[PDB]
Ligand binder design. Structure first.
Ligand SMILES: [Zn+2]
Length: 394
């Protein structure tokens, strides 16, 4: 396997983040049918991190960020969340001339949002081939953190943290900085509750105010939510079009499909059990950032600007493990959930009782980033800004 210039006519632009481009397969080859390709963009491990991750040697010995992320997903994440819901991808060889071709294609096809985005990195010789999770109604949920901290290291001035989800508090700061059109009714505690009624309530809230937490795809094309944490509450107009976009797929009368869809997503999520395993990893944040931040300053060997005498007394081994676990928690807190459906016709699944319909589903965790050690400082600063603002507004 080696991709090159004539193969580049087989891939269409799908999307991108800050670091990677995603192209979908448009060709015919039984090899890449239902596959996407992840290509590194140009930009322009540290020893501490190498010391922090020393346990997993392959990770520290990775020659580039692509390999680093794959092995983090494969070697650190998969043992925690299980292979069933995580696709780490298959590395493929790529030629410089393939990449140079993809470059020209991306600059011509990128949406307006992305017209000045970074070039493809043409020095690279590898890309990642992954299953297309959109291929089918696809539902992407960014759930955020689903528990309330109880930590001893949370001081008396910050006690609302013990009472009010980090998400709900953040909404107020977002609304202050004019980043959202209004407060979302979504509560992660509901979604992670293990309660059927509460999950459905969460899904309805996500549908109503998607922000950047709820997107729905038809065959990989956005039919709800999308670019705009800033885009507002689902309007009559948007609601109506979405209802119609569901026609044929959900077999109910005009106007009733949306409610069946929401039920379907709710049943899939609760049924799958995927939130429980995710919640466990979020809870690898055992101390709260207000605890874990002290351990951080002991790893980078610097006086602590926060000072918790006992956290600084720990042996180095135990500090490394705590930050390590916080950082893995941070992956789980910031990942997304992709639920893919297809309807069975009369000739893992969910049923709708009024419809008499059946739906295959698959669930994957996506967006599983390795968090750089240094980010602890910004984890702390954001945390301090969130609570003081909520405190100030109470
Ligand atoms: Zn300290």
């Amino acid at each position: 396997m080696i991709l090159e210039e004539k193969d580049a006519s087989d891939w269409i632009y799908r999307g991108e983040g800050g670091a990677n481009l995603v192209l979908a397969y448009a060709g015919s080859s039984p090899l890449f049918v239902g596959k996407v390709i992840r290509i590194q963009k140009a930009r322009r491990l540290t020893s501490d991190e190498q010391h922090l991750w020393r346990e997993n040697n392959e990770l520290i010995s990775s020659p580039n960020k692509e390999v680093l992320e794959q092995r983090y997903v494969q070697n650190v994440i998969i043992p925690l969340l299980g292979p069933k819901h995580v696709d780490a991808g298959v590395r493929v060889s790529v030629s410089k001339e393939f990449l140079e071709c993809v470059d020209k294609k991306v600059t011509k096809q990128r949406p307006l949002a992305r017209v000045n985005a970074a070039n493809v990195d043409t020095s690279h010789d590898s890309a990642l081939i992954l299953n297309d999770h959109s291929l089918c109604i696809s539902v992407e949920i960014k759930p955020k953190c689903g528990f309330l901290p109880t930590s001893r290291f949370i001081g008396k001035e910050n006690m609302l943290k013990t009472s009010v989800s980090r998400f709900k508090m953040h909404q107020l700061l977002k609304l202050e900085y004019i980043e959202i059109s209004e407060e979302s009714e979504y509560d992660p505690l509901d979604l992670f509750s293990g309660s059927k009624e509460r999950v459905l309530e969460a899904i309805k809230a996500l549908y109503s105010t998607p922000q950047n937490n709820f997107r729905v795809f038809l065959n990989g094309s956005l039919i709800l939510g999308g670019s705009g944490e800033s885009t507002g509450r689902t309007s009559p107009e948007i609601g109506y079009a979405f209802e119609d976009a569901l026609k044929g797929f959900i077999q109910s009368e005009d106007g009733h499909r949306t409610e069946c869809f929401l039920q379907l997503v709710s049943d899939a999520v609760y049924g799958s059990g995927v939130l429980d395993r995710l919640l466990e990893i979020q809870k690898l944040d055992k101390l709260d950032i207000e605890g874990a931040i002290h351990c951080y300053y002991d790893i980078i060997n610097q006086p602590c600007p926060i000072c918790e005498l006992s956290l600084h007394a720990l042996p180095l081994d135990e500090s490394l493990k705590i930050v390590k676990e916080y950082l893995i928690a941070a992956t789980a807190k910031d990942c997304s959930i992709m639920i893919s459906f297809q309807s069975r016709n009369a000739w893992d699944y969910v049923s709708l009782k009024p419809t008499n319909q059946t739906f295959d589903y698959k669930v994957h965790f996506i967006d599983l980033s390795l968090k750089p050690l240094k980010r602890m400082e910004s984890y702390y600063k954001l945390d301090k800004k969130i609570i003081s603002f909520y405190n100030r507004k109470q």
